[PDB]
Amino acid sequence: SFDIWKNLDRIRSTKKNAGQFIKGSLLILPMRTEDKQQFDECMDELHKYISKDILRCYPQKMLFYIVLKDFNILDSCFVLSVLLAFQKRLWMAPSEKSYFRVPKNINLTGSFYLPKNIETGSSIVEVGFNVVPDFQQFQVKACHVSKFMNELSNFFSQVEFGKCEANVINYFKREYNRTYSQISLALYELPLIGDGLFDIKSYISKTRPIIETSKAQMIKHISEMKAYNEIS
């Protein structure tokens, strides 16, 4: 039963009023794409049902910030399932090109960010050491077809948000862009480490005698250990 519509009906049947929307709820899922026209077709197919108010995207100027505001419990599982299934399908079976059908053996895997001012009080874990300062990042692993939806319901039925800022989304965009520009620059300094931007000429004239005396101490230590070892 790897069909999102049947799974949605199943979760609607017995998740105790999952259609009710969380007050002040916000979820940000940044994603990347290598083809634009197929992701756009998938996004129109998504928008025809998700409605424009709940779900919105900001193409950064390739990055697509998919943002959920005031999302319903049932709608969250649907959007995450469709989006993660498409993002995985881009590489696994690019020949099927079916959007609302998840082929078997595909395991959902991804990440989504939540505002830091949320309180928690087995398949979805919060991650330590998050680079984004004011956001909490989560990871989804080992998901079949119904296990992911059940875990999402059991997780979002518990967590609760509070008093989100008016323009937190722009802050997230700015901070993500800053961190990835930083890593791009970090890769850009790779070739120039040697004397390119490091003042090696006067570095060496200071660090030469220390290395020389360290070499002398090393050879003395080896001789001393050899004499300690052999009986001779």
């Binding site: 090696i200 570095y203 090393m218 230590h221 250990m225 070892n229 052999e230």
Partner: protein, 183 residues
């Protein structure tokens, strides 16, 4: 009279277990089907090795690393690992000269006095402990400026060491399969 005093303690008398400079590892329970080359192959990737010996018929050997970190990693990782179908129990030991001296001293039961293993004479700046080398340099902190020769002299590590390591790995994977070395 102040209520805070510096702590004072008694020394544990410098045996081979309580010596912080001890680097040698005593491997016990060998199956006698293993030789010095195979034991060196077992205990090489944890660090550089000064000497490896196996007394004839004594079913035990010694591995003298250079770094205390390497010896601790070897003891922590290779414990109960069966060499030649026989499980192996690792513990700290002593050298060969110190072993002979201790044996003659307990035969004569005179003193039973040990001497601490020599230190590295800190500070040393080039070395990074638990590092491997097999065969210009700006002396920047990221790399390893100095290292130990594989048996012993001291050579300045270059950027071609990673190439040489893979080259030798492929060489010994090709030849070792044909059977010129069990190592």
């Amino acid at each position: 009279m102040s209520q805070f005093i510096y702590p004072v303690q008694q020394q544990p008398s410098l045996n081979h277990f309580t010596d912080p400079n001890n680097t040698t590892v005593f491997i016990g329970g060998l199956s006698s089907l293993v030789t010095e080359d195979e034991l060196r192959a077992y205990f090489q990737p944890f660090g550089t090795i000064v000497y490896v010996k196996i007394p004839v018929g004594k079913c035990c050997g010694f591995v003298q690393y250079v770094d205390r970190l390497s010896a601790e990693a070897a003891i922590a990782g290779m414990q109960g690992f069966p060499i030649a179908n026989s499980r192996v129990r690792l513990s700290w030991g002593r050298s060969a000269k110190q072993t002979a001296l201790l044996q003659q001293a307990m035969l004569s039961n005179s003193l039973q006095v040990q001497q601490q293993q020599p230190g590295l004479q800190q500070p040393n700046y080039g070395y990074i402990p638990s590092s491997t080398c097999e065969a210009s340099s700006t002396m920047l902190p990221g790399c390893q400026i100095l290292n130990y020769s594989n048996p012993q002299q001291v050579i300045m590590q270059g950027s071609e060491a990673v190439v040489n390591s893979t080259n030798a790995m492929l060489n010994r994977l090709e030849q070792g399969s044909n059977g010129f070395m069990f190592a």
